[PDB]
Amino acid sequence: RQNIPLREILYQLSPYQQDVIRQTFTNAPKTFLRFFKEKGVGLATFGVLFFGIKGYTEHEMHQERLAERY
Amino acid sequence: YGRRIPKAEMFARIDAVDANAIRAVADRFIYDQDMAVASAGDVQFVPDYNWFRRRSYWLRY
To answer: Which family, according to UniProt (chain B) (predicted)?
Structure first.
């Protein structure tokens, strides 16, 4: 394994001197909002392109069925 | 200790320790207990706390 020159001091605490699932209920709305802020633009771009092109195609398909309609 | 232990008492206390007492003391102090680990120098390959913590007990028994 490689040799990485590094100067630090690392502290770790035991898993049994800590809570397991009690900060999830506190950090849950902040995590939700941070996720949507970080990935908001791409999800919006994907949704707008997909649903707009699908709606345009479906509208034109209905128009073409009505154009041949007796 | 608040006193001076005579050497006869220290010898009698040492002479009362057998293999059962060593087993019981190690079972009280070591087995499946948290420990403290300190290191210095070239320590990039020293295992972390969970590696040390899992090797305080035996699943084979």
So the answer is: Belongs to the peptidase M16 family.
- All residues of chain A having their beta carbon less than 8 Å from the beta carbon of residue B48 are 12
What's the resolution in A?
2.4
B34 with A4: Cβ contact below 8 A: no
Count CA atoms closer than 13 A to A6's CA, side-chain side.
11
Burial state string for B7-43 with b = 16 or more CB within 10 A and e = fewer than 16: eeeeeeeeeeeeeeeeeeeeeeeeeeeeeeeeeeeee
Asked if the Cβ–Cβ distance from B45 to A4 is below 8 Å, we say: no
